[PDB]
């Protein structure tokens, strides 16, 4: 049968033009008052999945 997407992964990663994946940074959901504006500002843009983790993401998203 067709492989099933890991649906939680599909909600967290989007494939980019050269076949990497963008994700949102962790640590910007709550407990924000104590965090420096600089730290939070750098967490706001999307980031690319690292080399070590790409295998895990690709396994989860066969139809990306």
């Amino acid at each position: 049968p067709k492989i099933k997407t890991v649906r939680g992964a599909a909600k967290r990663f989007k494939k980019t033009g050269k076949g990497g994946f963008k994700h949102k940074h962790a640590n910007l959901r709550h407990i924000l008052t104590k965090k420096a504006t600089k730290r939070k500002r750098h967490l706001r843009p999307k980031a690319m999945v690292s080399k070590g983790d790409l295998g895990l993401v690709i396994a989860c998203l066969p139809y990306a």
């Binding site: 890991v6 939680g8 992964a9 967290r12 994700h23 949102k24 962790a26 983790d53 895990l56």
Partner: protein, 144 residues
């Protein structure tokens, strides 16, 4: 050319691995699985994304965004597609008739990709700044 003088191309037919057929094969005994543990077992191995119990990457990162229903009914047309319609009048129905866009597409944009050389009239479609200049340079026109 006989049924007993045909050969496959060199490199086209690699023999499959056969595990567990003795020492000389190089895949005897353990069959490439190493010694013991979950991965050596029949049916053995952990599920996709499992990292040993550490919160996995697809759960320690946050969800983001929503899915647009409008994006699914919006297409992009290349300049190369404009010559492929019948009659040199590009609109949503003529693009559908030429199999350029799907039946359920409601909105389409012409972008600067490929080349237009024939003169064409684009009707009821959005056109990029660059596509507009290319269509008009090729003698065409864009009707809003």
């Amino acid at each position: 050319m006989r049924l007993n003088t045909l050969s496959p191309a060199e490199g086209s037919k690699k023999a499959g691995k056969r595990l567990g057929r003795g020492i000389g094969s190089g895949l005897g005994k353990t069959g490439g699985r190493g010694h013991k543990g979950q991965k050596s077992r029949s049916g053995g191995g952990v599920r996709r994304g499992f990292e040993g119990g550490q919160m996995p990457l697809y759960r320690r990162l946050p969800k983001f965004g929503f899915t647009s229903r409008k994006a699914a009914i919006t297409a992009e047309i290349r300049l190369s597609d404009l010559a492929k319609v019948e009659g040199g009048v590009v609109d949503l129905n003529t693009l559908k008739a030429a199999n350029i866009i799907g039946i359920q597409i409601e909105f389409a944009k012409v972008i600067l990709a490929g080349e237009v050389t024939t003169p064409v009239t684009v009707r009821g479609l959005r056109v990029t700044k660059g596509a507009r200049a290319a269509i008009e340079a090729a003698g065409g026109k864009i009707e809003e």
